Design a protein around this motif. Structure first.
Motif, PDB file in Angstrom:
ATOM      1  N   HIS D  97       0.839  -1.186   0.000  1.00  0.00           N
ATOM      2  CA  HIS D  97       0.000   0.000   0.000  1.00  0.00           C
ATOM      3  C   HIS D  97       0.885   1.251   0.000  1.00  0.00           C
ATOM      4  O   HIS D  97       1.748   1.424   0.870  1.00  0.00           O
ATOM      5  CB  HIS D  97      -0.927  -0.017   1.223  1.00  0.00           C
ATOM      6  CG  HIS D  97      -1.957   1.073   1.219  1.00  0.00           C
ATOM      7  ND1 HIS D  97      -2.871   1.232   0.198  1.00  0.00           N
ATOM      8  CD2 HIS D  97      -2.207   2.068   2.103  1.00  0.00           C
ATOM      9  CE1 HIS D  97      -3.634   2.281   0.450  1.00  0.00           C
ATOM     10  NE2 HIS D  97      -3.252   2.807   1.600  1.00  0.00           N
ATOM     11  N   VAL D  98       0.661   2.112  -0.990  1.00  0.00           N
ATOM     12  CA  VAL D  98       1.419   3.346  -1.153  1.00  0.00           C
ATOM     13  C   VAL D  98       0.494   4.563  -1.127  1.00  0.00           C
ATOM     14  O   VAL D  98      -0.470   4.616  -1.893  1.00  0.00           O
ATOM     15  CB  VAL D  98       2.160   3.336  -2.498  1.00  0.00           C
ATOM     16  CG1 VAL D  98       2.977   4.594  -2.646  1.00  0.00           C
ATOM     17  CG2 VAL D  98       3.045   2.109  -2.593  1.00  0.00           C
ATOM     18  N   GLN D  99       0.782   5.536  -0.258  1.00  0.00           N
ATOM     19  CA  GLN D  99      -0.050   6.744  -0.177  1.00  0.00           C
ATOM     20  C   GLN D  99       0.737   8.041  -0.032  1.00  0.00           C
ATOM     21  O   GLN D  99       1.796   8.090   0.602  1.00  0.00           O
ATOM     22  CB  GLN D  99      -1.037   6.673   0.994  1.00  0.00           C
ATOM     23  CG  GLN D  99      -1.291   5.289   1.537  1.00  0.00           C
ATOM     24  CD  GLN D  99      -1.229   5.260   3.051  1.00  0.00           C
ATOM     25  OE1 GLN D  99      -1.986   5.958   3.727  1.00  0.00           O
ATOM     26  NE2 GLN D  99      -0.317   4.456   3.591  1.00  0.00           N
ATOM     27  N   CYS D 100       0.183   9.093  -0.628  1.00  0.00           N
ATOM     28  CA  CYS D 100       0.767  10.425  -0.576  1.00  0.00           C
ATOM     29  C   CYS D 100      -0.216  11.294   0.174  1.00  0.00           C
ATOM     30  O   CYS D 100      -1.404  10.980   0.268  1.00  0.00           O
ATOM     31  CB  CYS D 100       0.921  11.040  -1.968  1.00  0.00           C
ATOM     32  SG  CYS D 100       1.657  10.008  -3.220  1.00  0.00           S
ATOM     33  N   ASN D 101       0.287  12.403   0.689  1.00  0.00           N
ATOM     34  CA  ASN D 101      -0.548  13.345   1.396  1.00  0.00           C
ATOM     35  C   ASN D 101      -0.217  14.695   0.775  1.00  0.00           C
ATOM     36  O   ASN D 101       0.842  15.264   1.043  1.00  0.00           O
ATOM     37  CB  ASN D 101      -0.213  13.321   2.882  1.00  0.00           C
ATOM     38  CG  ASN D 101      -0.147  11.918   3.429  1.00  0.00           C
ATOM     39  OD1 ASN D 101       0.817  11.190   3.191  1.00  0.00           O
ATOM     40  ND2 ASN D 101      -1.180  11.521   4.153  1.00  0.00           N
ATOM     41  N   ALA D 102      -1.113  15.189  -0.079  1.00  0.00           N
ATOM     42  CA  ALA D 102      -0.897  16.467  -0.753  1.00  0.00           C
ATOM     43  C   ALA D 102      -2.177  17.269  -0.920  1.00  0.00           C
ATOM     44  O   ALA D 102      -3.257  16.706  -1.084  1.00  0.00           O
ATOM     45  CB  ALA D 102      -0.260  16.232  -2.110  1.00  0.00           C
ATOM     46  N   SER D 103      -2.037  18.591  -0.891  1.00  0.00           N
ATOM     47  CA  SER D 103      -3.172  19.496  -1.039  1.00  0.00           C
ATOM     48  C   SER D 103      -3.657  19.441  -2.473  1.00  0.00           C
ATOM     49  O   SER D 103      -2.916  19.046  -3.374  1.00  0.00           O
ATOM     50  CB  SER D 103      -2.773  20.938  -0.712  1.00  0.00           C
ATOM     51  OG  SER D 103      -1.946  21.485  -1.727  1.00  0.00           O
ATOM     52  N   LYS D 104      -4.901  19.848  -2.685  1.00  0.00           N
ATOM     53  CA  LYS D 104      -5.454  19.837  -4.020  1.00  0.00           C
ATOM     54  C   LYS D 104      -4.699  20.845  -4.887  1.00  0.00           C
ATOM     55  O   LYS D 104      -5.092  21.107  -6.017  1.00  0.00           O
ATOM     56  CB  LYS D 104      -6.939  20.184  -3.964  1.00  0.00           C
ATOM     57  CG  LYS D 104      -7.792  19.281  -3.058  1.00  0.00           C
ATOM     58  CD  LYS D 104      -9.233  19.809  -3.040  1.00  0.00           C
ATOM     59  CE  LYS D 104     -10.186  19.061  -2.112  1.00  0.00           C
ATOM     60  NZ  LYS D 104     -11.523  19.760  -2.069  1.00  0.00           N
ATOM     61  N   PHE D 105      -3.611  21.405  -4.361  1.00  0.00           N
ATOM     62  CA  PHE D 105      -2.815  22.372  -5.114  1.00  0.00           C
ATOM     63  C   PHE D 105      -1.455  21.871  -5.571  1.00  0.00           C
ATOM     64  O   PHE D 105      -0.599  22.665  -5.983  1.00  0.00           O
ATOM     65  CB  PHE D 105      -2.629  23.655  -4.318  1.00  0.00           C
ATOM     66  CG  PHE D 105      -3.890  24.410  -4.123  1.00  0.00           C
ATOM     67  CD1 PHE D 105      -4.827  23.980  -3.193  1.00  0.00           C
ATOM     68  CD2 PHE D 105      -4.172  25.522  -4.906  1.00  0.00           C
ATOM     69  CE1 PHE D 105      -6.030  24.642  -3.043  1.00  0.00           C
ATOM     70  CE2 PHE D 105      -5.377  26.195  -4.768  1.00  0.00           C
ATOM     71  CZ  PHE D 105      -6.309  25.752  -3.832  1.00  0.00           C
ATOM     72  N   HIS D 106      -1.257  20.560  -5.484  1.00  0.00           N
ATOM     73  CA  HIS D 106      -0.021  19.931  -5.933  1.00  0.00           C
ATOM     74  C   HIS D 106      -0.417  19.105  -7.146  1.00  0.00           C
ATOM     75  O   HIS D 106      -1.591  18.757  -7.310  1.00  0.00           O
ATOM     76  CB  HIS D 106       0.559  18.996  -4.864  1.00  0.00           C
ATOM     77  CG  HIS D 106       1.098  19.700  -3.658  1.00  0.00           C
ATOM     78  ND1 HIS D 106       0.292  20.347  -2.746  1.00  0.00           N
ATOM     79  CD2 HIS D 106       2.366  19.837  -3.203  1.00  0.00           C
ATOM     80  CE1 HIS D 106       1.041  20.851  -1.782  1.00  0.00           C
ATOM     81  NE2 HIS D 106       2.303  20.555  -2.034  1.00  0.00           N
ATOM     82  N   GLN D 107       0.545  18.804  -8.004  1.00  0.00           N
ATOM     83  CA  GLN D 107       0.255  17.996  -9.177  1.00  0.00           C
ATOM     84  C   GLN D 107       1.372  17.004  -9.411  1.00  0.00           C
ATOM     85  O   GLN D 107       2.540  17.300  -9.169  1.00  0.00           O
ATOM     86  CB  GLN D 107       0.046  18.874 -10.421  1.00  0.00           C
ATOM     87  CG  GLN D 107       0.873  20.155 -10.473  1.00  0.00           C
ATOM     88  CD  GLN D 107       0.694  20.916 -11.780  1.00  0.00           C
ATOM     89  OE1 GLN D 107       1.150  20.472 -12.843  1.00  0.00           O
ATOM     90  NE2 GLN D 107       0.018  22.066 -11.709  1.00  0.00           N
ATOM     91  N   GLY D 108       0.997  15.817  -9.870  1.00  0.00           N
ATOM     92  CA  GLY D 108       1.980  14.787 -10.125  1.00  0.00           C
ATOM     93  C   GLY D 108       1.308  13.480 -10.483  1.00  0.00           C
ATOM     94  O   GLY D 108       0.086  13.355 -10.383  1.00  0.00           O
TER      95      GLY D 108
END
Lengths: 119, 237, 218, 237, 237
Positions: D97-108
């Protein structure tokens, strides 16, 4: 579309069958088989190429190559501009993924390669 | 969200917002016992009736408003402009779809209504003594449309404050972005000329001005997509 | 509880004054003791704006004729009122043969006889009179011209081979009846400049209604 | 949203995004009629099989990509690294399981795929005439992982553009943040060495670069949590 | 005698002389399980399929013969030439009708046959040593057609004396004047190019020369009227 979540807009993706020359502008491409893509609604979209056939033989130089001619074309125009709120990057990228339908086929094994086992 | 298709045209649109069927009537055809029952009027289904997506206009703070004429807008465009021109008579209904693409950080409100027999009236010289008649570029702008110069009176001496009396729909950025309108054939005759008479005109004006803080995209693309309904033609030339 | 008064017919009834003919003895005005009046329902000032509330309309008109001398006097003079349908030729002179063309309804009456009165049908070859036409008839001066809205002409004249002995004034009233209207539209808020188009004064563009100081003061 | 638990490990994760069961097979055990039916292989259930949450790696604009080897990553970690080491043979399935934590203002966009027998190939001197073999820190990076230096060819002379041919899943910041993958035991033998052979390697590379306006957190934490499935061991030492 | 109509085209023709259905097959359509089952090929019925009446050629004593190519002849003409050009593929059957108008005092005999893949061969310089390839005006004459220069070998090194082996019909002035021929789509492929490949060519040659006594009209008008059968197109441009 891999841009920021806050971005929105529309892209026109048109296919010009083999022979038809790349549409002059967006509007002329708008009359062809096209798809308006709003990445504000859906982050993905899949286009189907009805058909492509590498069957027409060609003996140019002195080396015979069973070539296309069916160079179908896929154009992509900015239907609208890229819209974003303060705080979001003014550029985003897109990734193309392709595959063939289940109706695909191939004929005539022909081993050819630039990469070979070195001495 | 989902995408609907009509031939070779595929638009990505929201599930099914509230549509406005102008005057409660659905663009239908015209029966056999009419004026021209001999010259059986051919009704296009194939390509003629599909999704046309006009050159997106850019909303600005200073924008005054826009308007297109019908069927003028399409008599130039594609295989429909094909029929409209080399044919003697025409009757057709319309599905009009207008959408904006803006961040939750923009604000505005566009009234979008349709007005039968939209007759433009210019300024008349200024002082009121010149009988100047609106040009041809003002009477039939095409698919690029045309900008109002006196929105308040809708370039014709009528309050816009009362335009709601026509098939209209609102587009408030903080609630919706797409507006849809079904228009039936409206005219004092069964059929008519497609190049001389513009049965109606699509109106879209900023009632609450576009606004945003420095840094957000300064122009909001408005995309008009429209499709002909139960369109008929008679007398080829 | 009743709303009979807010109906179309109720709104448009009443015979209003839409025309006035002058037939002076000595004068620059109608020198040949006769006159031609193409039917204009805008003749009643108030009218134009009321009808221009709708895009299409249909109706019949009841015409009543009131004739007297300028002081409103009654005299022993006979008159001919001729209605020339659209497409029929109006009289160019006081002896044009049009005056005798049976296909031009005519009615005679003495000034003493009470008002003349006749009904005229929905002429238009179209399904309805339409106040607005966004096109031209198969920059131009033919813009907004729906001709098929003509009702006809009314030709008036003193009977007889010779000029009348008295100065006369005819007034034409018109009651609209059996009215049907379609596609309502914004109430004209700017002053009218011409009888043909909706053109307005682009300098004198006034706010629909009375203004005030602040939006917090009454 | 809800939280699942396996012993003393409790992770807060989203309801049930689309999981990718690699090659359509579920990490199962191995029957009695095998090679070693005598030395009955003991199958850990208690603590051995639970949620391990590796040292979060920080995504950057310049990040090239990361990769871990299996079972190497865990042979160092806890009571599982306990079994892998002091045992002769090993077979085990994996839930990654892989997860990121980013605001709706990051892109990738991170492609996350698993590749059996991932054999690293270094640069070979540069000009192509040095037969340099990848170190041990490059062949078995542990639980910290290792960074690609030539992502385009996946540090091994193969187009990444074709990595999708392996059990993969995408993580587009503007749509999802967590990706999950079930991996069965894949090897030419029923059992094998847990310290000498790395059946496969977890790959996670930025295909669309991380981006954001000045002021937003500049690094996006990527958290890898993984759990052993139907893991077996034989021959204690 | 009676007159048949197909849309806006109305020809006055004789009741029903003997028709020649070339190779015993009727111009039919092409089923769904083909090469392009996706790009559903639109089949014209409306105007596209009707009676075209080509510029009448005048028979003379010295006339050598005429020939047209298909579908070339129509790719220039009307709404059919419309489809043939702005479309990628084409398959179509044909009804060809040829008629003369002559007094019972004229004499002649025209063989009228259709020949698949009619490949023109020029003279080759004369002495046989020039590899000159027939022009474009000779390979695809259009709707005016083209005159043979060596009828005996049909401008291609083949005896005409053997042309009867092809779908043919005779027109002997002292017996008939109209000849009719139904042609199916014939090609090594389901569909093909409408502008590059001419599936066949219509041939009409005077086998017995036109003759008459001084005073009778010296030229006999030959009128070719033809109509497309089960015509299909695919891939608009």
């Amino acid at each position: 579309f891999t841009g920021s979540f806050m971005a929105t807009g529309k892209m026109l993706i048109a296919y010009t069958p083999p022979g038809g020359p790349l549409p002059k502008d967006r509007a002329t491409a708008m009359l062809g088989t096209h798809v308006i893509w709003d990445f504000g609604l859906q982050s993905s979209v899949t286009l189907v190429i009805p058909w492509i056939s590498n069957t027409h033989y060609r003996a140019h130089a002195r080396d015979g190559v069973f070539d296309y001619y069916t160079t179908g074309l896929v154009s992509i125009w900015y239907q609208t501009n890229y819209v974003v709120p303060i705080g979001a990057p003014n550029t985003a990228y897109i990734i193309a993924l392709a595959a063939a339908q289940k109706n695909f086929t191939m004929k005539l094994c022909k081993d050819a390669s630039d990469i070979l086992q070195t001495g | 969200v989902a995408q609907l298709t009509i031939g070779n045209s595929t638009i990505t649109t929201q599930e099914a917002a509230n549509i406005i069927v102008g005057y409660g009537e659905w663009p239908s055809y015209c029966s056999d016992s009419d004026a021209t029952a001999v010259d059986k009027p051919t009704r296009p289904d194939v390509s003629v009736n599909r999704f046309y997506t006009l050159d997106t206009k850019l909303w600005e703070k200073s924008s005054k408003g826009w308007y297109w004429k019908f069927p003028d807008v399409l008599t130039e465009t594609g295989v429909f402009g094909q029929n409209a021109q080399f044919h003697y008579l025409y009757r057709s209904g319309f599905c009009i779809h207008v959408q904006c693409n803006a961040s939750k950080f923009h604000q505005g409100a566009l009234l979008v209504a349709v007005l039968p027999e939209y007759v433009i009236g210019t300024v008349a010289g200024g002082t009121g003594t010149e009988d100047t008649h609106p040009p041809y570029k003002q009477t039939q702008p095409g698919a690029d449309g045309f900008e109002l110069q006196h929105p308040y009176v809708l370039d014709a001496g009528i309050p816009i404050s009362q335009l709601t009396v026509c098939p209209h729909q609102w587009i408030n950025l903080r609630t919706n972005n797409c507006a849809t309108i079904i228009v039936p054939y409206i005219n004092a005759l069964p059929f008519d000329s497609a190049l001389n008479h513009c049965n109606f005109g699509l109106l879209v004006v900023p009632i609450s001005p576009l606004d945003y803080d420095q840094g957000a995209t300064p122009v909001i693309p408005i995309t008009i997509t429209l499709a002909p309904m139960c369109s008929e033609f008679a007398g080829l030339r | 509880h009743s709303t009979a008064e807010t109906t179309l017919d109720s709104f448009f009834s009443r015979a209003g004054l839409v025309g006035e003919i002058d037939l002076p003895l000595k004068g620059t005005t109608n020198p040949n003791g006769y006159a031609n009046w193409d039917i204009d329902i805008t003749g009643y000032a108030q009218m134009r704006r009321k009808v221009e509330l709708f895009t299409y309309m249909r109706f019949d008109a009841e015409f009543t004729f009131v004739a007297c001398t300028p002081t409103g006097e009654v005299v022993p003079q006979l008159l001919q009122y001729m209605f020339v349908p659209p497409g029929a030729p109006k009289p160019d002179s006081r002896e044009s043969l049009a005056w005798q063309t049976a296909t031009n309804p005519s009615v005679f009456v003495k000034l003493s006889d009470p008002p003349a009165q006749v009904s005229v049908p929905f002429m238009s070859p179209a399904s309805a009179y339409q106040w607005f036409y966004d096109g031209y008839p198969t920059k131009d001066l033919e813009y907004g011209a729906m001709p098929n809205n003509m009702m006809g002409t009314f030709s008036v004249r003193t009977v007889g081979t010779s000029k009348s002995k008295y100065p006369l004034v005819v007034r034409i009233y018109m009651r609209m009846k059996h009215v049907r209207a379609w596609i309502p539209r914004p109430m004209r808020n700017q002053n009218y400049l011409f009888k043909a188009n909706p053109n307005y004064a682009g300098n004198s563009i006034k706010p629909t209604g009375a203004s005030r100081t602040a939006i917090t003061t009454l």
